[PDB]
Amino acid sequence: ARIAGVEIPRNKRVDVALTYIYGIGKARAKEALEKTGINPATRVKDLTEAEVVRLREYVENTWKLEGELRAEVAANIKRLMDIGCYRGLRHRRGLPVRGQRTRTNARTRKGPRKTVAGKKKAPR
Amino acid sequence: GKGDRRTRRGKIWRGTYGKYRPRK
Amino acid sequence: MLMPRRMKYRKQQRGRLKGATKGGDYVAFGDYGLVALEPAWITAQQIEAARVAMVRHFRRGGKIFIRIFPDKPYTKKPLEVRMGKGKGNVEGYVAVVKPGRVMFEVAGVTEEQAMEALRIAGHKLPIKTKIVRRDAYDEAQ
Amino acid sequence: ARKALIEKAKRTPKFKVRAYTRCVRCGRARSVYRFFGLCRICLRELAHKGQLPGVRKASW
RNA sequence: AAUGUAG
RNA sequence: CGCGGGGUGGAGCAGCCUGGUAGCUCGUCGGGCUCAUAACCCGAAGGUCGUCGGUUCAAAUCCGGCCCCCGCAACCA
RNA sequence: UCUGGUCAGCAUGGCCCUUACGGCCUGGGCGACACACGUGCUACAAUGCCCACUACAAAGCGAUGCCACCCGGCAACGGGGAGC
């Protein structure tokens, strides 16, 4: 059941199985099931060799899709190394690119806490 | 849940409407 | 001061000084030499001293070519001690020099400055020296 | 920068966005009720003098 | 189960 | 010179006779307890093993060479 | 009681600036970020989560305003448009 390259769902209701593709979520899933006219309550376990090909036809041909989707976004972040837009940086310093408070959180874009400190107050 | 902007409760808690919460 | 970077062996036997020079006996680099007229061990401290005087004379001026190199170790027992108990400790290093060895050499200088510089150096050396030119020292074809 | 401010708030030149509210008694700009036109202090002080018609201490 | 700068 | 011992995180010491894991106490940092500071509690950081070679697959460890520090011996005349 | 807070809401004794410590504007900043603490929100799921259907509130608020209801659009919203 290897529709996209290294990607293979199985024994789960196909509707959400197709989620298990980079470039495919609940939306582009349901969208394709009516157009292929297949009951999503059915499992990857069980279906015609025709059903399978019918599905991979529609999907792989329409949009993209792990590999060259993934490779595409990167080249767009790459192009923000032009003369260097604002969104170019933030990508350069791995910080929030979307106008936020760095003073506190941001941990999702910043690897867990580099506590590193040695500040002082009064001895005498 | 109350932040999955692609849901019933997601729009509810935010107080806006869309696909995932049809305006009437 | 002026010594090898490694040696196969740390101490070595004194040996002897048969005549002649074997090689290093003709000019080859600069335009004036200082040649040996007697065999000797020349110590690094002497070489250096002479060399410095040379430069000091034609201060920072031409070029100098030191053609002997102290590879031989120079042992010496501690002071006041008696005989035996192995060879002595290494104090310095010498260059074995034998008559007709061209020890120094100079380039980019007037004969006056050169003549003189060398003379000076010859003084720092514990042997008799002679000055040279660039005769039939051109072993070619 | 107080007085020149309260006088710049009077006139409504330049881009209607900038037409902000400003307390009438007080030189205040923050915490003014459009209805009363007054600062939250200004308000509360008048309230207490009855100078606000029908406006009473609440209690429920 | 210690401690608390001068006026 | 004549023998013998030491050199490891900031301090004091393991590990080395028995190559492959650097351990311990104090201290430092960040967070607790206090009105606050110790005391106490939580969790981290930090070592080129003085130094250059040699052996080994592999060196803090085995082998030498230099650089420091401490200990003994220097008697018969 | 805390020489508690507030001269920066306003008032106010005094001190101090009076081609500037006043005043006008453009652009920036107050939103910075190796870090640490406070108040918080959403979660870690099956007494759950999701989709279709269907009930029961109160207190408010609304004209260069709240918008019924139709129509475009997956939707934000955008056209029309009744009532107030």
Domain of residue C106, CATH code: 3.90.1170.10
Answer whether the bond into residue A65 is a cis peptide, omega within 30°. Answer: yes
A115 touches strand F (CB under 7 A): yes
Q: What is the DSSP letter of C70?
A: -
Q: Report how far residue A95's alpha carbon sits from residue A97's, in angstroms, rounded to the nearest whole number.
A: 6
Q: Report how far residue C64's alpha carbon sits from residue A111's, in angstroms, rounded to the nearest whole number.
A: 62
Beta strands in C40-97 (DSSP E): 40-43, 63-64, 72-76, 89-97
Structure token pair of residue C119: 């003379």
Is the distance from CB of C99 to CB of C19 less than 8 angstroms? Answer: yes
Locate the domains of chain D by residue range: 1-60
Instruction: Give the resolution in Å.
Output: 3.3
Task: Give the chains touching C; criterion: ≥3 Cβ pairs < 8 Å.
Answer: none
Q: Report how far residue C73's alpha carbon sits from residue C12's, in angstroms, rounded to the nearest whole number.
A: 7
Q: Report how far residue C81's alpha carbon sits from residue C3's, in angstroms, rounded to the nearest whole number.
A: 27
Q: Report how far residue C112's alpha carbon sits from residue C70's, in angstroms, rounded to the nearest whole number.
A: 30
Look at residue C5 and tell me if it is in a domain: no
Report the CATH fold assignment for D1-60: 30s Ribosomal Protein S14; Chain N (4.10.830)
B15 touches strand G (CB under 7 A): no
Residue lying closest to nucleotide G21, CA to C1': D1
Q: Report how far residue C134's alpha carbon sits from residue C50's, in angstroms, rounded to the nearest whole number.
A: 22
SS3 C7: coil
Domain of residue C44: give its range. 29-137
Q: Report how far residue A5's alpha carbon sits from residue A71's, in angstroms, rounded to the nearest whole number.
A: 14
Q: Which nucleotide is nearest to A96 (CA to C1')?
A: G33
Look at residue C21 and tell me if it is in a domain: no
Q: What are phi and psi of C128, to 5 degrees?
A: -85, 140
Q: Name residue, tokens 């040379």.
A: C54
Q: Name residue, tokens 């157009």.
A: A35
* Residues 6+ away with beta carbon under 8 Å from C131: C32, C33, C34, C35, C115, C118, C119
User: Counting Cβ atoms within 10 Å, is residue A93 exposed (0-12), middle (13-18) or buried (19+)?
Assistant: exposed
Q: Name residue, tokens 């037409």.
A: D19
Is the distance from CB of C103 to CB of C29 less than 8 angstroms? Answer: no
Residue D23 assigned ligand-binding role: yes
A117 touches strand G (CB under 7 A): yes
Q: Name residue, tokens 């400003």.
A: D22
Q: What are phi and psi of C7, to 5 degrees?
A: -135, 150
A117 touches strand F (CB under 7 A): yes
C19 touches strand F (CB under 7 A): no
Look at residue C12 and tell me if it is in a domain: no
Is the distance from CB of C5 to CB of C79 less than 8 angstroms? Answer: no
Q: How was this structure determined?
A: X-ray
- Structural domains counted in chain C: 1
Q: Which nucleotide is nearest to D23 (CA to C1')?
A: G9
Among candidate residues A44, A37, A54, A39, the one with its CA nearest the CA of residue A17: A44
